[PDB]
Amino acid sequence: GSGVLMVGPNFRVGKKIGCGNFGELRLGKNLYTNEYVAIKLEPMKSRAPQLHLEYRFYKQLGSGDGIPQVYYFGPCGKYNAMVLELLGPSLEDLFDLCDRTFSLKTVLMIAIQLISRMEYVHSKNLIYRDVKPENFLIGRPGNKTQQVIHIIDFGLAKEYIDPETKKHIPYREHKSLTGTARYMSINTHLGKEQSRRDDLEALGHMFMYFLRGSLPWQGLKADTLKERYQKIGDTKRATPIEVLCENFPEMATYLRYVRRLDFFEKPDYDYLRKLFTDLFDRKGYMFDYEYDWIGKQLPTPV
Ligand SMILES: CC(C)(C)c1ccc(Nc2nc3ccc(C#N)cc3[nH]2)cc1
């Protein structure tokens, strides 16, 4: 036939975009509306499927602020595909573009939005579990949500409230480590079941990462993943919050609060946001969405 890969009745699959994957994220086009989209692909032969249920997580999330719109899920050649709204570059891409350091203003504008974003996700009975700069993308120049920080990849998500019992998932240990070691919470390092508190702690680690330019456990290597994980964990525990957050009192207060939350406990999202909006106002900053990357030349697939 054609020679061209189609998804559903109107989505033309195009070049693969982004870094790493390996052909799992491709640019696409909606031939019917003449709009570009992002297409996530998973070989039907996959060992550990994640696509179809990530799709289900999106259905459960519904339409939300900062949540990419999902258009289709279906077979595509020897692939299973999920089609979503095309977005802009990730926070990691922007960080590199800004010489690997964000100003406090930029970081606070990011943190205020991400705390709300996480609260939205949690309000849908889901815990994220995959916090990292690569999973947060700004909108597209023009498509009016370019200043909005979006969250992607719910492949590692989990329902923390059992749909039938309506009870919080039970506490337990011995969970295998798979997530990204640089940002994960200390309790995650200990093999404990993750809950709402962990998503928040991970955000904190990321905030300090942006503010300092790096984290003090970032260069640890070992002979086995488990060994690398343990080392990073030991250093996180061995580094006092007052040292990690030197010169950023509010960041220390945030991190101390989340690190001390109980497993079943619902975080006080308003409290955490106010720590940052109070500081923001105190510094005299204006929440005008003028991040550090404003004015630069942004990487784009199209
Ligand atoms: C920096 C560069 C690699 C060119 C780049 C690559 C892709 C996008 N845009 C983009 N929109 C997306 C929507 C959903 C998902 C998922 N899951 C990934 C995306 N990536 C923006 C910039």
- The Cβ-side half-sphere exposure at 287, using a 13 Å CA radius, reads 15
Do the annotations mark residue 18 as ligand-binding?
A: yes
Beta-strand ranges (E) seen in 196-284 are none
Counting ligand 1 atoms within 8 A of each CB, the residue from 35, 84, 85, 293 with the most, and so the one to mutate, is: 84
CB 284 within 8 A of CB 275: no
What CATH superfamily is the domain 88-302? Transferase(Phosphotransferase) domain 1 (1.10.510.10)
Residues 135, 90: contact at Cβ < 8 Å?
Answer: yes
Residue found by looking up tokens 């023009």 in the block: 142
**What is the 8-class DSSP label of residue 210?**
H
Q: Which of 267, 277, 289 is nearest to 120 (CA)?
A: 267
Tokens representing 33 are 């509306």
Q: Measured between alpha carbons, how far is 177 from 13 in angstroms, rounded to an integer? A: 34
What DSSP state is assigned to residue 149? P
| Top mutation candidate among 85, 86, 134, 293 for ligand 1, by most atoms within 8 Å of CB | 86
Q: Determine the distance separating the centroid of ligand 1 and the alpha carbon of 74, expressed in angstroms.
A: 20
Distance CA 69, CA 63 (A): 7
3-class SS of residue 284: coil
Report the nearest atom of ligand 1 relative to the CA of 153.
Answer: 17
Reply yes or no on whether 130 is catalytic. Answer: yes
Burial class of 143 by CB neighbour count within 10 A (0 to 12, 13 to 18, 19+): middle
Looking at the chain, which residues constitute the CATH 3.30.200.20 domain(s)? 1-87
Q: How was this model experimentally determined? A: X-ray
Resolution in A: 2.1
Phi, psi (deg, nearest 5) at residue 121: -55, -45
Residue range 1-87, CATH number: 3.30.200.20
Nearest to 207 by CA among 48, 95, 54: 95
CATH code 1.10.510.10 region(s) in the chain = 88-302
Q: How far apart are CA 301 and CA 197, in angstroms?
A: 35
